[PDB]
């Protein structure tokens, strides 16, 4: 073992490695994006899609609020406290500041994601991307904004996060990247366009609230291989290519 | 009438039905597909789609778990439960197997569906098709699985059937399939893959649960003239083709 | 043990009490309740019997 | 058929019966008692026991009091009724005559009963015989008052009724009988005497409370072939006795 080019079964891990890295990058692989959203409180809601060709991720603004299954949420509060961001003084709420909205989101692709693709609609609490309708595009193209989340020297990820610290921070948010295909085969052309609308049936989504970054970390990042970068920027992910 | 070749009555039932058949079967027709999940206490939720050129059904493993409406449901202990499937040891619940979870499932197309077409993702707790991403392909295709539905001779619909008698069976599950087309003509082709896409919009979705395999087969298979195949192996439905 | 006392009761918990005496109703004579449900979840699945060693085997009676 | 010694089926009908009705009465078979409890809403507790050798029923006062499964039973008021009636003014009641206390009690025993063997011991609500324990014998041998249930000239059973009109019939109740046994071997001498303990740990019981005496009619005496007399004085049960 470990002495010449006869150690197959070091020859075979670098290749089962390898061969994971790469079928993820091929056509017939995933792609996938994670969106984060942080909560006073320290609990963090993630959402999950994975599909083929293409993947993404829309939510409006009472859907990214913290919502504690089985406990009290301040339900009757928390629906006129979002009658009053629709529109100023619109509401009834008993509260200035409602501690469940969202402080911060971090977006996270796949390494499978062709950057130059990654599409962003951020919208006002109504879901309108640039104040009125009539004067949006309907999306904005952020990847240059994404970081690459780094181990052992390769990149496991993508990362965007940005803080909504203030008042007026009230967002709606979708996301959206392609596969990678540095091919030309262009896979929504005809001869396979159904494929790519049959993916968006089969797209797997996920969703839960952890209650505390240590947790997401140890008990979902963790034990899928996914990539994380932390608010202590640390990156999580495990690199395959070529590795043992 | 029933004597000679101008019992038109009987010439024109026969067409009625017929044309049903082969309208279903056209272009112009609806796809659809059923996803039926059991449960311990012997009721059964059902999710169909109708759509046309292609359908499909895709939910997480919390979506396919019983809910009562209206009922207690155990929430918070249902929520630690799901904590625990979707890492060991990750959740706090009071109970070691959750009679929420599905016993088993069947999908069952219409028969305007092409079986050639048909793809599964039957992901993880996480909604991972295959261990881990890096290694997923994000569909099988399970065509060849699917029973023919059959009354009178005829075809009525295509089932695929399958237990999840295990403690380990903690599934998320999306499926899909393509309308039927003999001819050579693209339907998203350039010249018509804008309806494509708005046949994703105008696709409609039913939900319910029924307390009862009988209660199913009797106020939502028969009424509405769907296949359906028992838990005792009896085909339901309606042959049309050639047929008063 | 009645056929009530064997049924799972799941101590300061809910045990959705009025459906399940429904349920015994329905169990006692066929349609002889009004249940919201086709098989309890309280039922025993199955039953093991042990004795001690200082049983005589010969003497068992069920 | 029904012409002569040769109708087989007719013979084999009237044995398969007369059977039934002699393996009854047989050492090797049960004996049975019931008690049933009437309520003024018109619902009725019963309270059976079966099985070999001997059988009986030993209820307090406060067992013998209605209690309706999963709805409101008063239970605190009730508690206090029970402190007031097992001492006069010794509770803190808000009511004069709890609606929960039993009206009549029937006591029935299986036909395979021997009605000299029939003991009481009705109590009062602290659970003693006769006043003071000092001065009680344990039990009244009751048979004498027991009425023969008759139905197509067979006694299907044996009644004893009896009302509880008064403010002050407040009780504790338990009755026994042995089976019949018109042999000179005794089942309780040494050969059989541990058999005879056996049958202590294996009679079953069975518990219930329906909501009308057509419903105790109609769904518990009917079905399982008991006899039955109701408050009109009709006879219920089935003659096997040399019968088809």
């Known amino acids: ?12 891990q670098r290749l089962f ?4 890295y790469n079928y993820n990058n091929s056509l017939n692989g995933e792609v996938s994006v994670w969106v ?68 911060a989101i971090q977006i996270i692709f796949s390494p499978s994601v062709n950057v130059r693709t990654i599409k962003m609609a951020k ?4 879901s309108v991307p640039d104040e009125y309708l009539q004067r949006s595009h309907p999306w904005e193209a952020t990847g240059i904004k994404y970081r690459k989340i780094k181990r052992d020297g390769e990149i496991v990820g ?36 159904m494929d790519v609308f049959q993916s968006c049936d089969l ?16 008990h979902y990042i963790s034990p899928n291989a996914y990539p994380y970068l932390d608010i202590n920027n640390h990156s999580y992910g495990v690199a395959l290519s070529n590795r043992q």
């Not at 470990?2 to 150690?7: A, H, K, L």
């Not at 909560?39 to 990214?64: P, R």
């Not at 919208?123 to 109504?126: F, R």
């Open 158 to 193: 993508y990362s965007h996060y940005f803080e909504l610290p203030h008042e007026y921070n009230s967002i709606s948010l979708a996301v959206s990247g392609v596969h990678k295909n540095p091919s030309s085969y262009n896979v929504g052309s005809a001869h396979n366009v």
């Open 1 to 12: 073992a470990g002495t010449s080019n006869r150690d197959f079964a070091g020859r075979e």
């Open 203 to 218: 797209a797997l989504r996920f969703c839960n609230r952890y209650w505390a970054e240590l947790e997401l970390v140890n």
């Open 123 to 126: 919208g006002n609490a109504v």
């Open 17 to 20: 490695n390898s061969e994971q």
């Open 36 to 103: 984060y959203a942080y909560y006073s409180d320290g609990s963090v809601l993630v959402i999950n899609k994975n599909s083929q060709y293409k993947v993404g991720i829309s939510e409006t603004f009472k859907a990214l609020k913290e919502y504690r299954c089985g406990q009290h949420n301040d339900s009757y509060d928390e629906c006129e406290v979002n009658q009053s961001i629709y529109y100023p003084n619109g509401g009834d709420a008993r509260k200035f500041h409602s501690n469940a909205k969202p402080r």
